[PDB]
Amino acid sequence: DISFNAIPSDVRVPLTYIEFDNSNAVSGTPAPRQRVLMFGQSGSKASAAPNVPVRIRSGSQASAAFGQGSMLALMADAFLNANRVAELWCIPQGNGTGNAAVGEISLSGTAGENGSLVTYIAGQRLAVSVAAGATGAALADLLVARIKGQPDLPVTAEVRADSGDDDTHADVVLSAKFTGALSAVDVRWNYYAGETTPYGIITAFKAASGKNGNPDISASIAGMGDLQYKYIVMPYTDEPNLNLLRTELQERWGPVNQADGFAVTVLSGTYGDISTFGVSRNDHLISCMGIAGAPEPSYLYAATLCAVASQALSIDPARPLQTLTLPGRMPPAVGDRFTWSERNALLFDGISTFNVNDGGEMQIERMITMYRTNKYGDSDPSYLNVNTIATLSYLRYSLRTRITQKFPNYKLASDGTRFATGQAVVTPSVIKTELLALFEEWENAGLVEDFDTFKEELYVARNKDDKDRLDVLCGPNLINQFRIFAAQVQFIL
């Protein structure tokens, strides 16, 4: 007897009855959609509700909704330029504790030549025409006019007079649109080769003191949503926000929610600060790429890093990221880039590293989580790689998708049960054969390794304590990336 649905066994009308069953229809597993959620900050005049997840499909729309010049708008623009297919969500955080002022630019001196002046603020480049025999006040006025002409700058600038005996010197006071621990921006001069400043102008940047506080992600997490949310960017890098995210991501990582996530962040600072952060976090659901002297702010790098990682791991999870490039991301200036030893030490701390290709393009050396020790004090490589986390998440998704579709409502029985050919009965042997078939499926896909050990260690058994349950203990033996390659010649002369 075939186990029917909606065809009563108590029917006697001689008309034929045909049934369409949606089970046992999809083969393989559907590729998951790329969901990325950025916990950015929105400045004033933003028309979007803070602490509410909003979908955004264009950079201009994100800027209009999240406040023009807010760091979340810039993060969204970078992400969308680096990735289009991925479905993108964003949650603004309003504003946090800390002064709104960033610093001052002292542009003093008297024009000696007839060149040009370039100022790089938050990565964005600003050009001012320098006229021969011109004072510094005029150049400061032109520079502040240029700054106001570019809405995308996270900081707005106002001109302030000398307030002294001198006349050429003048100040440009910056003020971040969003108030947070990342309100401070990086200001430099003559970044790209071939650019230079005229002899007369003396450029300096007086950074205002004070460490601002990141806004608390409390209402943001309490209304984050229930979707998959594959990747969760986090520009904030202070202890309490990341601890809250740790609690949420460990709750999600558990078997009671089944939804997986990953927290991609970036830190820009001194090598010691990056190393201490990496050795202190110790969370195997979060990854960071430390940078030093970054012309752009941290969150702009974080957006592109998440975009590239999401695309490259949704295409193939176990595939490494040794060569994937970050498009349009400005590298640190030469002499401040991490050397080989520094990058290897960072990889052994927990902080991911990057390589700058010839020409200035930035590439991903090795992106890893913060897992460096077991529950004991000893070291652990089980969750070291981001590829391991992505592959495990995909494996759980695949197994859940197949199980909840092929066996929606069936009847478990012992292995030696003589049920009908088409009857909907699941036995430990049936589940073992099904799991072996699915294992061969993703092995042909290329996400796993040796099949003999998986077949030998696959254990499916009825729970003797409580019925209506199957206990499954398997060993996948994940496939491993190419990583390093060491060879000894041992030449014979």
State how far Cα 207 lies from the chain centre: 29
Q: Which of residues 170-229 bind a copy of itself (CB under 8 A)?
A: none
Answer for which of 26, 127, 145, 161 binds a copy of itself (CB under 8 A) is 26
120 contributes a contact to a copy of itself by CB under 8 A: no
Stretch that binds a copy of itself, among 97-105, 179-187, 191-199, 365-373 (CB under 8 A): 365-373
The angle at the Cα of 466, spanning 462 to 426, to the nearest 5 degrees, equals 35
Q: Which is nearer to a copy of itself, 26 or 145 (CB)?
A: 26
**Residues 456, 458, 463, 468, CA torsion sign:** negative
234 — phi, psi (to 5°)?
-145, 90
Which of 230, 296, 291 is CA-nearest to residue 263? 230
356 contributes a contact to a copy of itself by CB under 8 A: no
Strands 171-176 and 155-160: antiparallel
Q: Which two tokens stand for residue 38?
A: 């950025």
2 contributes a contact to a copy of itself by CB under 8 A: yes
Which of 413, 409, 308 is CA-nearest to residue 362? 308
Answer for which of 146, 169, 177, 319 binds a copy of itself (CB under 8 A) is 319
**Residues 464, 465, 467, 473, CA torsion sign:** negative
15 contributes a contact to a copy of itself by CB under 8 A: yes
CA atoms of 318 and 308, how far apart (whole Å):
15
Map tokens 């230079």 to a residue.
196
Least distance from a copy of itself to the Cβ atom of residue 94, Å: 22
Answer for which of 343, 362, 369, 390 binds a copy of itself (CB under 8 A) is 343
Bridge-partner residues for 204, per DSSP?
106
Binding mask 254-293 for a copy of itself (x = CB under 8 A): xxx-x------------xx--x------------------
CA atoms of 395 and 401, how far apart (whole Å):
10
47 contributes a contact to a copy of itself by CB under 8 A: no
Q: Which is nearer to a copy of itself, 330 or 474 (CB)?
A: 474
Answer for which of 97, 196, 243, 382 binds a copy of itself (CB under 8 A) is 382
CA atoms of 18 and 151, how far apart (whole Å):
64
Q: Are 98 and 91 in contact (CB under 8 A)?
A: no
Answer for which of 348, 361, 436, 455 binds a copy of itself (CB under 8 A) is 348
Least distance from a copy of itself to the Cβ atom of residue 70, Å: 20
Stretch that binds a copy of itself, among 62-70, 102-110, 115-123, 363-371 (CB under 8 A): 363-371
DSSP symbols for 337-348: S--HHHHHHHHH
Q: Are 290 and 278 in contact (CB under 8 A)?
A: yes
Stretch that binds a copy of itself, among 116-124, 181-189, 295-303, 390-398 (CB under 8 A): 390-398
**Residues 459, 463, 464, 468, CA torsion sign:** negative
Binding mask 419-438 for a copy of itself (x = CB under 8 A): xxxxxxxx------------
Stretch that binds a copy of itself, among 171-179, 209-217, 238-246, 312-320 (CB under 8 A): 312-320
Least distance from a copy of itself to the Cβ atom of residue 42, Å: 18
Which of 169, 154, 167 is CA-nearest to residue 202? 169
Stretch that binds a copy of itself, among 152-160, 167-175, 240-248, 448-456 (CB under 8 A): 448-456
Q: Which is nearer to a copy of itself, 68 or 405 (CB)?
A: 405
Question: The sheet that has 54-55: what strands, in order across it?
Answer: 54-55, 87-90, 35-38, 231-233, 263-268, 286-291
Answer for which of 133, 210, 223, 475 binds a copy of itself (CB under 8 A) is 475
CA distances from 481 to 368, 386, 404 (A): 13, 11, 30
Q: CB 308: neighbour CB atoms within 10 A?
A: 24
Q: Which is nearer to a copy of itself, 79 or 236 (CB)?
A: 79
Q: Which of residues 449-468 bind a copy of itself (CB under 8 A)?
A: 449-453, 459, 461, 463-468
Which of 294, 234, 237, 223 is CA-nearest to residue 264? 234
Least distance from a copy of itself to the Cβ atom of residue 50, Å: 19
Least distance from a copy of itself to the Cβ atom of residue 5, Å: 7
Kindly determine how many residues on this chain lie close enough to bind a copy of itself according to the rule CB under 8 A. 157
Q: Which is nearer to a copy of itself, 118 or 403 (CB)?
A: 403
CA atoms of 366 and 38, how far apart (whole Å):
22
Q: Which of residues 49-68 bind a copy of itself (CB under 8 A)?
A: 55, 57
Stretch that binds a copy of itself, among 41-49, 184-192, 210-218, 346-354 (CB under 8 A): 346-354
Answer for which of 137, 356, 413, 436 binds a copy of itself (CB under 8 A) is 413
Q: Which is nearer to a copy of itself, 169 or 366 (CB)?
A: 366
Q: Are 128 and 191 in contact (CB under 8 A)?
A: no
Stretch that binds a copy of itself, among 91-99, 129-137, 296-304, 405-413 (CB under 8 A): 405-413
